[PDB]
Amino acid sequence: VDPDQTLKACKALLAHIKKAETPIWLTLTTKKHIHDSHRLQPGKIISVCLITADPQRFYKNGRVIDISHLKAKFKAYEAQRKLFSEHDVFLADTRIINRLPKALGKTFYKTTTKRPIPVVLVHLSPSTNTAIKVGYANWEPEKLAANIETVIRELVERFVPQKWQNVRNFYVKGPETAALPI
Amino acid sequence: FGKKKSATAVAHVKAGKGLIKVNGSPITLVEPEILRFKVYEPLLLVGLDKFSNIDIRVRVTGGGHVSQVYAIRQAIAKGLVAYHQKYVDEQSKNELKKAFTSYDRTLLIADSRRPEPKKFGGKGARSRFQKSYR
Amino acid sequence: EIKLFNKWSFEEVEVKDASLVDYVQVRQPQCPIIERLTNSLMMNGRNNGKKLKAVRIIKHTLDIINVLTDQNPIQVVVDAITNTGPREDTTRVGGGGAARRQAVDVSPLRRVNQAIALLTIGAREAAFRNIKTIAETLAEELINAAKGSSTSYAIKKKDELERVAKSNR
RNA sequence: ACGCGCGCUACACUGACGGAGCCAGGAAACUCCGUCGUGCUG
């Protein structure tokens, strides 16, 4: 929450990690918000593939994944896994989103935060919490905190009705390391 | 108007111009090609009386590939000769016809074949599984 | 069903020794005229279990098998299964034990057929030239059955069957 | 330890392999374009 407190969080997290450069994840749980309403947050506050049909597909022609292929890919995990590894971001026609999560979501979601961005990020989904990648082991503690702040800013703005008050608990953690509560 | 061995092609008839579109395309394409003729060979087949005409074209769809191809086939000349007199020939439409079927099998009506039938056996149909009790 | 045309359309209406022509584009005695042979050359090609590509096969085998020293392609194909049939082989005996086998015709449609799926076979059995041109083996071998119509050179058993049904006769 | 039977998929160049085309009662076999080089290779 406060800068000093987060700095400690980050510092402690680095020290604890023990046993490749790990990455730092920030996790926050929310309270007293109904996930049913459009309380859910999906936002881009914290190689490209395009999934879509004509127009969108035309502009892309970037790798293009056509509407027809979506079911086929859901069926063959082997190819889908490869596609996910190859590209950093995915953009998808918004209407297509139901189908893509049904078929693709298991591979794309999980951790490899690959879920596509709709076109005519922090993604809560129906669940109360959020996990976001804030930075690397390489970067300074100060930078990690700054990044965390940008993430926090989005929440503050959304439930402007309560703001940060909603955050039940915040934690930081390295890939390998254990989570530490702010 | 003509279906082919589990497939089926529909006929469009009312005088117009060039570009006769099959499905929603152009009997230039029709890309399950190789034997992409035998389609452009009904129109070509018009080689017996006419040269192309100046009329219409409709869409097909049923079963699978070569099925459809063979369907769109009759589809065409089974619709040049269309009654007539607004389609076929306002008189003696045996013009084409008997000509567009003195070497035909598509417009030459359809084939009495059609998938079905198996057997309490192996694969079924007739090929009954391979057993050799001792 | 279900081939094409053009591609040369060199229709040699002669070349048909012995009988044959009275069934050069036939089948009956049991089809009718199962498109002028080349509908069976192309068909005897479905030895994996499905035509088309088979169709290609034929076609390629053709443009190839004519490009290379053209004899009107189709007439190489006719003149292929032409001077390239069996002619009175033997067939069991029963008159012994322990048979022996006597010989004779060769019911035309035979001669055509029994040489058709045959030239077809010799082709299929690549292994020389074990290249990658199915239509080549299919051609050359059929070409080595047009040029080969000058000994031997691919058929062979062609003779054998006959150059054998003489002694044990 | 091993025997007998119904099979499944393979020995591959009509192939395997990636992109792509379509359509049955995003089916697959399949068509095209390209990569592999008949070597227990892919």
Domain limits, chain C: 1-169
State how far the Cα of C106 lies from the Cα of C19, in Å rounded to an integer.
Answer: 11
Q: Is residue B3 part of a domain?
A: yes
**Mapped to the 3 state alphabet, what secondary structure does C49-113 carry?**
CCCCCHHHHHHHHHHHHHHCCCCCCHHHHHHHHHCCCCCCCECCCCCCCCCCCCECCCCCHHHHH
| Residue B17 phi, psi (nearest 5) | -125, -145
Nearest residue to nucleotide D5, by CA–C1' distance, is: B133
Angle A167-A169-A173 (CA atoms, 0-180°, nearest 5)? 120
Q: What is the resolution of this structure in A?
A: 7.3
Give domain C1-169's CATH architecture: Orthogonal Bundle (1.10)
Alpha helices in B25-133 (DSSP H): 40-43, 65-77
Q: Are strands A48-51 and A89-93 parallel, antiparallel or unpaired?
A: parallel
Tokens linked to A169 = 């608990």
Q: Is residue B129 part of a domain?
A: no
SS3 A180: strand
Read off the amino acid at residue B72. Answer: I
State how far the Cα of C17 lies from the Cα of C96, in Å rounded to an integer.
Answer: 37
Task: List A63's β-bridge partners, or say none.
Answer: A49
Q: How far is CA C26 from CA A106, A126, B53, C108, in A?
A: 60, 73, 35, 11
Tokens linked to A133 = 């990648």
Tokens 């029994």 locate to C114
Please say whether the dihedral angle defined by the alpha carbons of residues C24, C28, C32 and C37, taken in this order, is positive or negative.
Answer: negative
Read off the amino acid at residue A34. Answer: I
Any idea what the CATH number is for the domain that residue B57 is in? Answer: 3.30.230.10
Cα-only R_g, chain A: 18
Count CB pairs under 8 A between chains B and C. Answer: 20
Report whether C88 contacts C165 (CB < 8 A): yes
State how far the Cα of C126 lies from the Cα of C134, in Å rounded to an integer.
Answer: 8
Tokens linked to B17 = 């111009």
Number of domains in chain B: 1
Sheet bearing A180-181, strands edge to edge: A129-136, A23-30, A167-173, A180-181
Nucleotide nearest the Cα atom of A96 (by C1')? D26
State how far the Cα of A122 lies from the Cα of A25, in Å rounded to an integer.
Answer: 12
Q: Is residue B100 part of a domain?
A: yes
Q: Is residue B132 part of a domain?
A: no
State how far the Cα of B118 lies from the Cα of C153, in Å rounded to an integer.
Answer: 46
Q: Are strands A129-136 and A117-119 parallel, antiparallel or unpaired?
A: unpaired
| Residue A16 phi, psi (nearest 5) | -65, -40
State how far the Cα of A56 lies from the Cα of A54, in Å rounded to an integer.
Answer: 5
**Would you call B35 and C2 a contact, using CB atoms and an 8 Å cutoff?**
yes
Name the experimental technique.
cryo-EM
> Which partners does chain C have (≥3 C-beta pairs < 8 Å)?
B
Q: Is residue B125 part of a domain?
A: no
Report whether A128 contacts A3 (CB < 8 A): no
State how far the Cα of B23 lies from the Cα of B30, in Å rounded to an integer.
Answer: 9
User: In 3D, which of A135, A26, C59 has the Cα closest to residue B37?
Assistant: C59
Q: Which chain B residue has the Cα nearest residue C5?
A: B37
Read off the amino acid at residue C145. Answer: A
Give B19: exposed, middle or buried? Use CB within 10 Å, 0-12, 13-18, 19+.
exposed
- In chain A, after which residues does the backbone break, taking C–N over 2.5 angstroms as a break? 19, 46, 61, 120
Does residue A100 lie within 7 Å of nucleic acid chain D, judged by its CB? no
State how far the Cα of A130 lies from the Cα of C49, in Å rounded to an integer.
Answer: 56
- Kindly report the number of other CB atoms within 10 A of residue B123's CB atom: 11
Contact partners, residue C140, CB within 8 Å, separation at least 6: C65, C68, C129, C154
Q: Is residue B131 part of a domain?
A: no
State how far the Cα of C4 lies from the Cα of C55, in Å rounded to an integer.
Answer: 9
Give contacts of B38 with chain C, Cβ < 8 Å.
Answer: 2, 4
Tokens 């909603």 locate to A166
Q: Which domain holds residue B106?
A: 1-120
State how far the Cα of C45 lies from the Cα of C116, in Å rounded to an integer.
Answer: 10
Q: Is residue B128 part of a domain?
A: no
Exposed e or buried b for every residue in A130-144, given b needs 16+ CB within 10 A? bbbebbebebebeeb
Q: Are strands A167-173 and A23-30 parallel, antiparallel or unpaired?
A: antiparallel
Enter the DSSP assignment of A116: P
Task: List A91's β-bridge partners, or say none.
Answer: A50, A117
Tokens 């109904």 locate to A34
State how far the Cα of A67 lies from the Cα of A97, in Å rounded to an integer.
Answer: 11
Q: Is residue B20 part of a domain?
A: yes
Chain B: closest CA distance from residue C18 (Å): 28
State how far the Cα of A141 lies from the Cα of A10, in Å rounded to an integer.
Answer: 6
